[PDB]
Amino acid sequence: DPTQFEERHLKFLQQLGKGNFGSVEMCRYDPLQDNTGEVVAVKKLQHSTEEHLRDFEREIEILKSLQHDNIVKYKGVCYSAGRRNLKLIMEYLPYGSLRDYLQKHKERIDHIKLLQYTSQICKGMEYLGTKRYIHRDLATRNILVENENRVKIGDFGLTKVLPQDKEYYKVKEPGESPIFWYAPESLTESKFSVASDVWSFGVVLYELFTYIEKSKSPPAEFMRMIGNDKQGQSIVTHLIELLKNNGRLPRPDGCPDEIYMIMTECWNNNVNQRPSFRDLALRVDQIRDNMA
Ligand SMILES: COc1cc(-c2ccc(O)cc2)cc2cnc(N)nc12
Asked: Where does ATP bind?
């Protein structure tokens, strides 16, 4: 009953984001028309083709299956009559994306706080891995802020389920891809694994410690290293050669050595040498303990 939401009772309040092949809106589920209803986050498809609806239903089943303090909560689904368009209903995290939150407050969020968020992201990712899910799009823009003390992973739109007999998922015909967060084997062979999510986690750690300084973003820095003259497919070709030759994002200004060492270990060309999320959460919590 409460996981079944009638669309006619969903009142549009504001736009929240436009990520993959859809959009997220803040709505009030108000079946009493007195504006006393619950505020929820609603994901819908901008282009709801057969293929997109099929992938969106898998995203919904993925989100529904996850129950963790650092993963956005699934609330329900709204079904349309006839062609069966879908809306994913989720909890609304009022402080918005971690990217926007950090870009707004900057260094007013101290290192202790950044490491609390880092630990929460590792814990959400470690739990995701126990379900054999590969996020593929871990970035601060896809992490949401519930309050000053808690962040949660969102946007499971690129998430893949590992085959039963394989430790990677190969994407045959990729769509829009966040190449500046991709592990080298994801760029070269379109192979995604827990280890490529660890590589992305290293990029998220870099984002946090740059405080989202625009000129320091992973796309701005990698484009600077390959040359700003590179365009389209040439960007991927030169990025692969850069990573193969140990070109990496620089240490963020004022980043503690112990944190930078974690980033560089996540960015290992050798897939098997990257740390596990279980170990990362242990390591980050010890650093937090030493700082406290
Ligand atoms: C883009 O902003 C958001 C995205 C999601 C979300 C989560 C899981 C998922 O598979 C797809 C989308 C949820 C959101 C919740 N509260 C706010 N502020 N924003 C949100």
From this structure: 16-24, 43
